Amino acid sequence: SNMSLVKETVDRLLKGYDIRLRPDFGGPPVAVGMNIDIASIDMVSE
Amino acid sequence: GDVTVILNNLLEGYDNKLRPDIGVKPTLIHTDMYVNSIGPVNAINMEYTIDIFFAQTWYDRRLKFNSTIKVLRLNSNMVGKIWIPDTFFRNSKKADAHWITTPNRMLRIWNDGRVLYTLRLTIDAECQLQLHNFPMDEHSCPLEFSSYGYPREEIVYQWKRSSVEVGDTRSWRLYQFSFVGLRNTTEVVKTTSGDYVVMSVYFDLSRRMGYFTIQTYIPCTLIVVLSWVSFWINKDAVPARTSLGITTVLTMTTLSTIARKSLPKVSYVTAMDLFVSVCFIFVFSALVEYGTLHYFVSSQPARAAKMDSYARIFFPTAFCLFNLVYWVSYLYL
Numbered sequence: 001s002n003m004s005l006v007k008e009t010v011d012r013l014l015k016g017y018d019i020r021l022r023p024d025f026g027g028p029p030v031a032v033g034m035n036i037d038i039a040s041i042d043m044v045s046e
Numbered sequence: 047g048d049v050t051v052i053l054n055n056l057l058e059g060y061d062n063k064l065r066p067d068i069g070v071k072p073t074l075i076h077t078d079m080y081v082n083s084i085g086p087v088n089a090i091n092m093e094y095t096i097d098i099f100f101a102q103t104w105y106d107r108r109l110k111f112n113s114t115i116k117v118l119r120l121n122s123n124m125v126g127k128i129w130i131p132d133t134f135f136r137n138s139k140k141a142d143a144h145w146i147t148t149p150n151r152m153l154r155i156w157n158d159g160r161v162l163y164t165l166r167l168t169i170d171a172e173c174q175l176q177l178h179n180f181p182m183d184e185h186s187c188p189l190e191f192s193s194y195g196y197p198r199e200e201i202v203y204q205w206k207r208s209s210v211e212v213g214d215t216r217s218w219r220l221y222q223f224s225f226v227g228l229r230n231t232t233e234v235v236k237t238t239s240g241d242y243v244v245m246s247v248y249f250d251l252s253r254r255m256g257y258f259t260i261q262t263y264i265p266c267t268l269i270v271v272l273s274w275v276s277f278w279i280n281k282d283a284v285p286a287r288t289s290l291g292i293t294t295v296l297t298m299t300t301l302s303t304i305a306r307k308s309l310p311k312v313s314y315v316t317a318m319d320l321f322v323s324v325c326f327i328f329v330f331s332a333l334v335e336y337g338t339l340h341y342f343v344s345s346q347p348a349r350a351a352k353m354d355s356y357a358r359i360f361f362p363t364a365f366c367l368f369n370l371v372y373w374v375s376y377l378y379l
């Protein structure tokens with residue numbers, strides 16, 4: 001079924017995965033794009 | 047006995063990273079609450095504390111067993127092994143669960159996969175109080191929650207008929223306010239990630255008068271009548287009346303400072319600082335009136351003689367009028 005397919009896909013992705021190595025550990029740098037949604041500026045103390 | 051076998055068979059081949067029906071349909075979650083106490087509503091930080099018993103119930107076709115027992119009743123030892131929705135409160139400055147003595151959680155897995163998950167929370171929710179009409183102001187400020195990572199296509203919340211049920215409403219720490227009602231609401235918001243189903247519970251608070259009535263209103267009206275007392279002292283005793291006026295002004299400004307120090311720094315004019323400003327004006331006008339009286343005694347005595355008795359009637363009438371106007375207006379507004 002769809003749940004079994006998803007489970008097998010995720011188990012394949014996480015199997016044989018090294019956390020100590022960034023993506024493209026030898027080649028070019030990885031590009032990390034940032035978004036920020038400001039909820040509140042709470043208090044501004046002088 | 048056999049409950050261990052059931053619990054072992056439910057967690058064999060179970061992935062707690064995949065929501066139930068990951069690729070079929072959104073997960074319907076029924077949310078209930080139990081407001082223990084609505085903590086102090088401090089206006090300085092525009093926040094308020096609330097203590098609730100948050101209950102979430104959903105269907106999980108993977109936690110479906112077939113035995114004589116109908117329901118499995120469990121503590122917080124099996125909460126971290128099944129899928130649990132990531133409900134967060136969108137307007138909480140700081141909130142935290144309870145951990146003494148054992149994590150305050152409850153998990154009840156019925157026979158057909160229906161899961162009930164209950165926990166105890168203390169949320170310092172945020173609400174920007176519009177501090178006009180102070181202290182004759184009423185607020186209705188919410189508690190909003192929604193899923194964090196799952197958009198509307200994956201997690202849909204839905205209130206029950208008898209979802210939110212307040213407690214006794216008597217042992218709460220609502221000092222300056224008074225609980226008058228609540229109402230639940232469901233909407234859909236747009237975020238950079240997707241469309242989310244945001245639920246809200248609006249609590250209606252009405253500021254009961256009292257502390258301010260006896261902290262600023264009475265002191266200032268009593269200062270006003272103290273300033274009026276100078277109108278009867280004979281006009282020849284200058285130092286007495288000058289001391290009266292100037293010390294009355296000093297006390298008036300001190301009381302205004304305190305009254306404004308009660309509530310936070312707001313750049314608009316409230317209804318309390320308006321009152322203390324009118325009282326300040328009254329005191330200053332009584333003092334400049336005596337000043338002109340003393341100045342005119344040297345020029346024309348009969349003018350000052352008539353002016354004193356004129357002021358003796360003109361000041362209390364103008365103050366009664368002001369009061370009436372002010373109070374009536376704000377009570378109708």
Ligand SMILES: *[C@@H]1O[C@H](CO)[C@@H](O[C@@H]2O[C@H](CO)[C@@H](O[C@@H]3O[C@H](CO[C@H]4O[C@H](CO[C@H]5O[C@H](CO)[C@@H](O)[C@H](O)[C@@H]5O[C@H]5O[C@H](CO)[C@@H](O)[C@H](O)[C@@H]5O)[C@@H](O)[C@H](O[C@H]5O[C@H](CO)[C@@H](O)[C@H](O)[C@@H]5O)[C@@H]4O)[C@@H](O)[C@H](O[C@H]4O[C@H](CO)[C@@H](O)[C@H](O)[C@@H]4O[C@H]4O[C@H](CO)[C@@H](O)[C@H](O)[C@@H]4O[C@H]4O[C@H](CO)[C@@H](O)[C@H](O)[C@@H]4O)[C@@H]3O)[C@H](O)[C@H]2NC(C)=O)[C@H](O)[C@H]1NC(C)=O
Pocket residue numbers: 122123124125126127141142143145147148149
């Ligand atoms: C930057 O650094 C920061 C500091 O390092 C860091 O903060 C730390 O974050 C981590 C992770 O987020 C925290 O660790 C988790 O804490 C969870 C609860 O945290 C509350 O409690 C701790 C104190 O923890 C004690 O008390 C609880 C409750 O009794 C115990 O469960 C703990 O084991 C622990 O008990 C020991 O200490 C007690 C004395 O206090 C002793 O009496 C006791 O005997 C033990 O010796 C508080 O410090 C927390 O406060 C902080 O966090 C809150 C969060 O809101 C903040 O608001 C606050 O300001 C503080 O910052 C908080 O109050 C633990 O539940 C959790 O452990 C569970 O999860 C992990 C991961 O899933 C599991 O591996 C683990 O096994 C636990 O799961 C078991 O238990 C749960 C119970 O709910 C079961 O549901 C679950 O199924 C599982 O049971 C299974 O396994 C059991 C064995 O593990 C087994 O017994 C069962 O039978 C079953 O098989 C984890 O410890 C850590 O506390 C934070 N520390 C601090 C100082 O904040 C921060 O994240 C970092 N920032 C970033 C960005 O990285």
Ligand SMILES: *[C@@H]1O[C@H](CO)[C@@H](O[C@@H]2O[C@H](CO)[C@@H](O)[C@H](O)[C@H]2NC(C)=O)[C@H](O)[C@H]1NC(C)=O
Pocket residue numbers: 205206207209228229230
């Ligand atoms: C809490 O939410 C429920 C569900 O939206 C509300 O129950 C509805 O109430 C209206 C009028 O009272 C009825 O017409 C609907 O049929 C009810 N729906 C269901 C599913 O029972 C309830 O009113 C809300 N509580 C409030 C606003 O205090």
